[PDB]
Amino acid sequence: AGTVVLDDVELREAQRDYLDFLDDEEDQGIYQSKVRELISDNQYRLIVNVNDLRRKNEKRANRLLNNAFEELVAFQRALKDFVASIDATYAKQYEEFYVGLEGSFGSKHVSPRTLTSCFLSCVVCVEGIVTKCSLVRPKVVRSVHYCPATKKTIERRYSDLTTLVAFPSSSVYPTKDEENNPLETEYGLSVYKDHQTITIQEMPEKAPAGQLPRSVDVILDDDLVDKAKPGDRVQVVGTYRCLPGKKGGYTSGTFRTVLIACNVKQMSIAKIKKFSKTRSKDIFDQLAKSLAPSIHGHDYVKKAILCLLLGGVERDLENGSHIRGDINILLIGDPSVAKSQLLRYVLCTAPRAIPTTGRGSSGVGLTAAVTTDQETGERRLEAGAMVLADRGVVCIDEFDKMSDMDRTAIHEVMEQGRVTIAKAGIHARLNARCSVLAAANPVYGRYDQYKTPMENIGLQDSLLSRFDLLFIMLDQMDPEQDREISDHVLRMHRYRAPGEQDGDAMTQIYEKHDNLLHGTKKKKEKMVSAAFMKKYIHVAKIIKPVLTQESATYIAEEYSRLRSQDSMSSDTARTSPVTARTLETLIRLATAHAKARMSKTVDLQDAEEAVELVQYAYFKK
Amino acid sequence: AGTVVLDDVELREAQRDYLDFLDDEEDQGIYQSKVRELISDNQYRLIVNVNDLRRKNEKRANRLLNNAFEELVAFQRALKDFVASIDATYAKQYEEFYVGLEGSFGSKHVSPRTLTSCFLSCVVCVEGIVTKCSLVRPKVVRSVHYCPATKKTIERRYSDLTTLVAFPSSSVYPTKDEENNPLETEYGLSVYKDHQTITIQEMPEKAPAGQLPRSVDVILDDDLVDKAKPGDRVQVVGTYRCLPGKKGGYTSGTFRTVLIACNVKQMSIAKIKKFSKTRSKDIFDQLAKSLAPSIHGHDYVKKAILCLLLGGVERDLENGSHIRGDINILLIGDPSVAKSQLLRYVLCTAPRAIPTTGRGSSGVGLTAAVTTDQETGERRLEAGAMVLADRGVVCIDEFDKMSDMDRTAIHEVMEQGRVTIAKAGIHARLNARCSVLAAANPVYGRYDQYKTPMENIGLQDSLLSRFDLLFIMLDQMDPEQDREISDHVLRMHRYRAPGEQDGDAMTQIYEKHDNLLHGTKKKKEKMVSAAFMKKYIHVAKIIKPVLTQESATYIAEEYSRLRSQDSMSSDTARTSPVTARTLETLIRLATAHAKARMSKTVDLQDAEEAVELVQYAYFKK
Amino acid sequence: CNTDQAGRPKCPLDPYFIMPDKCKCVDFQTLKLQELPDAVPHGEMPRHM
Amino acid sequence: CNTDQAGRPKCPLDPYFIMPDKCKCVDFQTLKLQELPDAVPHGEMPRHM
DNA sequence: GCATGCATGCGCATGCATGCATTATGCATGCATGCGCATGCATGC
DNA sequence: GCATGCATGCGCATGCATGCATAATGCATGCATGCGCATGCATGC
Ligand SMILES: Nc1ncnc2c1ncn2[C@@H]1O[C@H](COP(=O)(O)OP(=O)(O)O)[C@@H](O)[C@H]1O
Ligand SMILES: Nc1ncnc2c1ncn2[C@@H]1O[C@H](COP(=O)(O)OP(=O)(O)O)[C@@H](O)[C@H]1O
Ligand SMILES: [Mg+2]
Ligand SMILES: [Mg+2]
């Protein structure tokens, strides 16, 4: 086609507007460093805040939201121009670059249930869960052929979705020469791009109760191929378009609507160094004390939860042997001792946390399963709760109600951290390294003091050895303790959020002091802010300490001392048996304490703290 | 169409070969100056000798003659490259340049009768006469449109004969926008090229006697539009191709063959300055003496013919008055005095010479005619012999046999030099400035001496006054004159061309002396070569002399003397009457003599020579 | 193809394609309705629409 | 159009055009012949071929 | 000079190669889901 | 531990929207040329 366009006021003006938008010379803009980062990382697309564009140029934002394709084309042209300007050499590699979108879209923030034809041809944002995914497939863009008879090579260009409507003249694969000499395809010189299709469903938590769900279909291009997986909660921003049906005579008048993604999102130094170096022991002291103001007392359980948050060190050797580094805890107590509050707080704070109660999930939904795909006849693996929580936390409330077979299944995860799966036609070893919290009621409803803990717990020695720590909590009815508990509870109850009028319906390292949440006496001390706590926890989890020679003999001698004291402990009973796992638990707790205070080696104080914890947990009066 | 070609050995090698062909750096080539001349003259095509190409590269010449289109494309690409190289600015004006061909094609030199399918797709050369021509018509190449509704302008490109076969998708004129908004054509911004069609017939002189003629059809492109006219003898070099018929289901299998022209040809200082400045009078002396060695004696007739060759000066004034500058001669003599030999020699030597005998051409075929074109119903003008011979020579043998009406028609050409034509619907004044030679036999077969020349000539005084000069030639049977004539005739008869073996079947200013053609006695003098004679005649015809005050009174007094001597001439009769035309004849002959010797002004000697000629011609014993 | 083309060659048979990006679209739904249980005749299967 | 095209859309009706530059050509002539005057029957018009 | 001959010239009919105009219906395939069957897992007593 | 219940699971039929395959003949127009006519030019006597 020889038709060309000479002038177009709108397109030229829009391109000029984007050129001025992405200059960042007389402004505090950052996009220049973003482009330099893209050049450094060999990536070929940019993400631009919609709110930023609206602030700088409201008319362009309005036009882009109301009309997508032409404005996106102008964006891509402007990106090509500026990439050529900054570094023309890098722009040679890729044909055209792409634009992502970000920011608060406002009215266009639309649920899969509320997508309508009113938003067609516009850019929309949607939040959902992923249910179906397809295999990655290549697609031809540029084809190259060679003719052995005449020693000539030719090239053909393809453009199918670049243009809105395609015709039979295009998309034809050449096979013969002008004189019927055969052509040989040369796959090395051709160009291909990847293609994938996914399906998104409205989350069951958001859908109205008792109603069937509604879903949308998404196409993922070459860059965003591997960014999504089934069973995942995502947010997708992209165009909403109609699908051209293939040629025919009579049409019913109903198109197919498909969302074409442009952005896919998985929804989620000096201060730290100074604080750590100055505090050392006070680091873990305050972190244990400031774990959760909403919960009263129970310092040992807070210490244990902090040890889970920091964790041990995974180790590997020459022979391929694996040594576990995770910690596991079981709490048993009387009703209303706030075990479930602790579980919920750990769910909120931990990065990868999944709650799975006793009978809520069975043995199949915990680890994994194998299903025969009807579409192809092959065998596929579906991951369970524990496989999804790799290097994460699984919380199990009402642990006693869980059946025996489920606990035998959990043995594989608790011992080695791997899951072996096999059915005729497929077999695999999946990684499931994880940590477990569990809370179980006593068998008699309330913990009996006179009976030994073995009768009350009612669990076999193997399962007890599987757990690193056992804790027993009691509701002692001391008048002064009850007074303290009532004071704390009513102080929390009377508190109201600042900035909210009374009677209405419904970052510094240390938190600001509060008259009610802290109290007048506590003015001499402060609590650590949640955000800094999370940052410090992440940094500590990164750090890799090493064990010293001073503490190894000390810990070994104390383990031997405990195994000999087994005969000496005559006035009290033992909660858990002492096996070879106890020594690994000692080393693990020592390393966790060494993680608490940023350093390079494990010292004696960490071993002493670990041993104090072990002595407290393993024996009771 | 997205199909492209990456490699082609033959085309690239041919382009490289032409690049090396047109370099002219380490060679004595001239094409660089040719390109510079083309840039100077704003022309956009080149002519290249085929024999030169064959000498430099025989394989390329063979391929070009055997295969035309691809090789011509390579030539045009190479021209574009070198025009860009020498001056890239000039190459911007024109899309692509073109190549002409020249030289001896040899076997491919083909008559319109001998063109066959064996020469299809090759470059051929043909010699013929032009019979039909068509009006010049523009053709669209690039179209430009504007939309007042959306203020957008678009452009479409057309390429019909650039590609061998065209399809209905192309050659479509756009009239509506994508949203049916009307478009307004803007003829200023579009691009057009001229187009013409002509027909060529084999010349009747070359065709076998008694057989019907055969013709070829030629298409003339934008550059060669005005290079041909009907009734013209031309040589055309170009491709010979088939013509694609328009779409249909059933075909008889017979194509139309059309020749596409690439070249159209109309078939045809120090020495001069030194010779003229040194010789002066001897210039015309030798030119008269060396006019034609094949003819014996008759110095006066040779002088008169030389005066025709040089001619007078055309003059114009303020009031639009026109003054004739041509000369006219009539010879009357006994049989075998070589009048027709003189006419044939003047035909051979003069640039534009046309022979038209007495009854060979009538009054209509002499001047012009008007014909009603059946194709359109309009009136068209067809030029006769005298209109074609503008600023030329018409030779009329057997002038006495011409009818009276034809001579009355010739009056208009002889007096003013123009032809007035009129028929209801059209009227014109055509230019016919010309000079006439005429030879007429005496009425009595042989010239009678005793009777006055008026009885012998038998022509009215008006026609005699129309002619500038009258000459009478006689065959006097003097024994010594007969001996001289026999010597000359037999010397010419015994002569043989040098380089030709005896008995076989069938540039220096001065000609080399010959033993027989000149003789032993004539060694003291030499004759002027024909080529230098033609060059000098052309240069003299260019020169524009001016009349001096010295000779005007002298000539006027001699004219009065002649008109008074009219009573004094009692012993002899007068051949021609003395009218006002005699004075103009005197001035004309004076200016012709002044042309003979290159100078700036007319002198007295030229007037004396003119008067001697007049005295000799106007009276006889 | 309803275009006046003289001298030009003509379009083939069935040359039309639907352009999806230049159409007006509206929402569409289908529902299934059942006869009221209060008015269904005794011993008769309910009817649908 | 005799090409196997699955998934691709198909060519229209009557899609073929004659390529003139890729054909072999030979010379062609027609003549008119008349019966010999030596053998034409008396009083009969001559025949042609 | 007047009487005659006549090569040129013009308008409307038919014959013949190319060229132009026309144009819905019937049959096949993959997605959704019912119905019978055997294995296997989980739950009581 | 053995007897029973049962939520999961698999393979082949039909129903229904989209999608796929087929496929020369008759009529119109411009170029070439015959046949009747009147004007006009040229040529004798
Ligand atoms: N130490 C404590 N500090 C503050 N509140 C507590 C404490 N112990 C119990 N509570 C209160 O008692 C309630 C116990 O509920 P829950 O955590 O479900 O108990 P359990 O998990 O033992 O069944 C909570 O709402 C909590 O507010
Ligand atoms: N002066 C001359 N010089 C040479 N040859 C002459 C001369 N006069 C006559 N002839 C010869 O006589 C012949 C005359 O023939 P031509 O020119 O036809 O005579 P005309 O033209 O008088 O009928 C010519 O062939 C020529 O060779
Ligand atoms: Mg609870
Ligand atoms: Mg003669």
In order, the DSSP letters of A44-98 are: -EEEEEHHHHHHH-HHHHHHHHH--HHHHHHHHHHHHHHHHHH-TTGGGT-S--E
**Interface contact D21-B247, CB threshold 8 A:** no
Atom of ligand 2 nearest to the CA of B475: 8
Nearest CA, atom 1, ligand 1: A296
Q: Which amino acid would we find at residue A137?
A: R
Say whether C14 and D15 touch across the interface (CB within 8 A).
no
Contact between B119 and B67 under an 8 Å Cβ cutoff? The reply is no
Report CA-CA distances (Å) from A50 to A98, A109, A123, A238, B230: 15, 13, 11, 13, 75
Task: Write out the two tokens for A89.
Answer: 């050499």
Tell me the C-alpha distance between A284 and A35, whole Å. 42
Quick one: tokens of A568? 């000496």
Decide: B341 in ligand 2 pocket, CB within 6 A. yes
> Is residue B228 within 8 Å of B264, Cβ to Cβ?
yes
Q: Rounded to an integer, what is the distance from CA A401 to the centroid of its chain?
A: 29
* Maximal C-alpha separation, chain D: 77
CB B382 within 8 A of CB B368: yes
Q: What is the DSSP letter of B247?
A: P
Looking at ligand 1, which atom is closest to the CA of residue A339?
Answer: 21
Partner residues linked to C9 by β-bridges: none
How many other C-beta atoms can be found within 10 angstroms of the C-beta atom of residue B528? 19
Q: Assign A197 to helix, strand or coil.
A: strand
What residue type is assigned to position A583 of the chain? L
Task: Compute the C-alpha angle A434/A437/A443, nearest 5°.
Answer: 140
CA of B441 to the centre of ligand 4 (A): 8
Contacts of A278 (CB under 8 A, 6+ apart): none
Residue A354 parent element (H or E):
strand A353-355
Residues with CB under 5 A from ligand 3 (ion): A 340
Q: Which residues of chain C does D12 touch, with a Cβ-Cβ cutoff of 8 Å? A: 12-15
CA distances A287 to A274, A279, A305, A325, A537, Å, are 16, 11, 11, 22, 10
Contacts of A45 (CB under 8 A, 6+ apart): A38, A97, A98, A99, A100, A223
Structure tokens at B358: 């007495």
The annotated binding site of B for ADP is made up of: 341, 381-383, 385
Q: How far apart are CA B242 and CA D25, in angstroms?
A: 9
Q: Are A416 and A324 in contact (CB under 8 A)?
A: yes
Q: d(Cα B142, Cα B155) in Å, to the nearest integer?
A: 7
Amino acid, single-letter form, for residue B548: T
Sequence-distant (6+) residues with CB within 8 A of D8 are A168, A171, A172
Instruction: Give every strand in the sheet of B328-333, ordered side by side.
Output: B353-355, B392-397, B434-440, B328-333, B469-473
Rounded CA separation B435/B312 (Å): 11
Q: How far apart are CA A30 and CA B537, in angstroms?
A: 87
Distance CA(B103)–CA(B64), nearest Å, equals 14
Q: Which of residues 10-39 of C touch A (CB under 8 A)?
A: 14, 17-21, 23, 25-28
Method: cryo-EM
CA dihedral A133, A136, A140, A146 (to 10 degrees): -160
Half-sphere exposure of B174 (CA within 13 A, CB side): 27
Amino acid, single-letter form, for residue A41: D
Which residues precede a break in chain D, with C-to-N distance above 2.5 Å? none
Core vs surface per residue B500-517: b (16+ CB within 10 A) or e:
eeeeeeeeeeebeeeeee
In terms of CA atoms, which chain B residue is nearest residue D13?
B249
Q: Is D6 exposed, middle or buried (0-12, 13-18, 19+ CB in 10 A)?
A: exposed
Q: Across the strands, what pairs with A440?
A: A332
Cβ(B75)–Cβ(B42) under 8 Å?
A: no
Atom 25 of ligand 1, nearest CA residue? A338
Phi, psi of A131 (to 5 degrees): -120, -40
Question: D9 to chain A nearest CA, in Å?
Answer: 5
Judged by DSSP in three states, A424 sits in coil
**Three-class SS of residue A25?**
coil
Which residues of chain C does A117 touch, with a Cβ-Cβ cutoff of 8 Å? 25-27
Q: Which nucleotide is nearest to B249 (CA to C1')?
A: F24
Q: If you write DSSP's letter for every residue of B265-320 in order, what string do you get?
A: EE---HHHHHHHHHHTHHHHHHHHHTS-TTS---HHHHHHHHHHHH----EE-TT-
- What lies within 8 Å, CB to CB, of B184 at 6+ separation is B145, B146, B147, B148
Cβ-based neighbour number of residue A470 at 10 Å:
19
| b (16+ CB within 10 A) / e for B165-188 | ebeeebeeeeeeeeeeeebeeeee
CB A472 within 8 A of CB A447: yes
Q: Decide if C9 touches B, using CB distance below 8 A.
A: yes
Q: Test C25 with A247 for CB contact under 8 angstroms.
A: no
Q: What are phi and psi of A592, to 5 degrees?
A: -65, -45
Mutate to test the interface with D, among A156, A167, A171 (most CBs of D within 10 A): A171
The answer to whether A165 contacts C23, with C-beta atoms less than 8 Å apart, is no
Alpha-carbon distance A471 to A334, whole Å? 12
Q: Long-range contacts for A543-547 (Cβ within 8 Å, ≥24 apart)?
A: A543/A595, A543/A598, A544/A313, A545/A313, A545/A591, A545/A594, A545/A595, A545/A599, A545/A600, A545/A601, A545/A602, A546/A600, A546/A601, A546/A602, A547/A587, A547/A590, A547/A591, A547/A601, A547/A602
Give B594-609 as a 3 state SS string. HHHCCCCEECHHHHHH
The token duo for A58 is 């409201």
Helix orientation angle between A69-86 and A31-41, rounded to the nearest 10 degrees: 80
Q: Point out residues after which chain A has a gap (C–N over 2.5 Å).
A: 268, 506
CA B460 vs CA B412, B465, B614: distances in Å: 16, 9, 20
* Distance from CA(B396) to C1'(F38), angstroms, rounded: 37
CA distance B120 to B26: 37
Cα distance between residue B421 and residue B524, in whole Å: 56
CA distance A220 to A195: 6
**HSE of B398, CA atoms in CB hemisphere, 13 A:** 10
B335 lines ligand 2 (CB under 6 A): yes
Q: How many CA atoms lie within 13 A of B11 on its CB side?
A: 14
Tell me the chain B residues in contact with residue A4 when contact means C-beta distances shorter than 8 Å: 154-157
* Residue C12 near residue D10, CB atoms below 8 Å: no
CB atoms within 10 A of CB B557: 10
For residue B599, give both structure tokens. Answer: 């100078």
What is the β-pairing status of strands A322-323 and A315-316? antiparallel
**Residue nearest ligand 2's atom 15 by CA:** B336
C-alpha to C-alpha distance for B334 and B459, rounded to whole angstroms:
17
- A6 close to B154: Cβ distance less than 8 angstroms: yes
| Distance of B461 CA from E1 C1′ (whole Å) | 24
Sign of the dihedral through C-alpha B218, B222, B226, B227? negative
Burial class for B107, CB neighbours closer than 10 Å (0-12, 13-18, 19+): exposed
DSSP states along B433-488: -EEEEEEE--TTSS--SSS-HHHHH---HHHHHHSSEEEEE-----HHHHHHHHHH
Decide: A152 and A174 in contact? Cβ < 8 Å. no
Please state, in angstroms and rounded to a whole number, the distance separating the CA atoms of residues B448 and B472.
Answer: 11
- Kindly state the tokens that stand for B444: 């009595």
Angle, helices A58-66 vs A69-86, to 10°: value is 120
Q: Which atom of ligand 1 is nearest to the CA of A333?
A: 22
Judged on CB neighbours under 10 Å (0-12, 13-18, 19+), B300 is: middle
Tally the C-alpha atoms within 13 A of residue A183's C-alpha that lie toward its C-beta.
20
DSSP state of A277: H
Residue environment code for A294-333, b if the CB has 16+ CB neighbours within 10 A, otherwise e: eeeebebbbbbbbbbbbbbbeeeeeeeeeebbbbbbbbbb
- What is the experimental resolution, given in Å to one decimal place? 3.1
Contact indicator for D15, D3 with CB cutoff of 8 Å: no
Closest CA to A172 of A150, A149, A145: A145
Structure tokens at A297: 């007392």
SS3 A465: helix
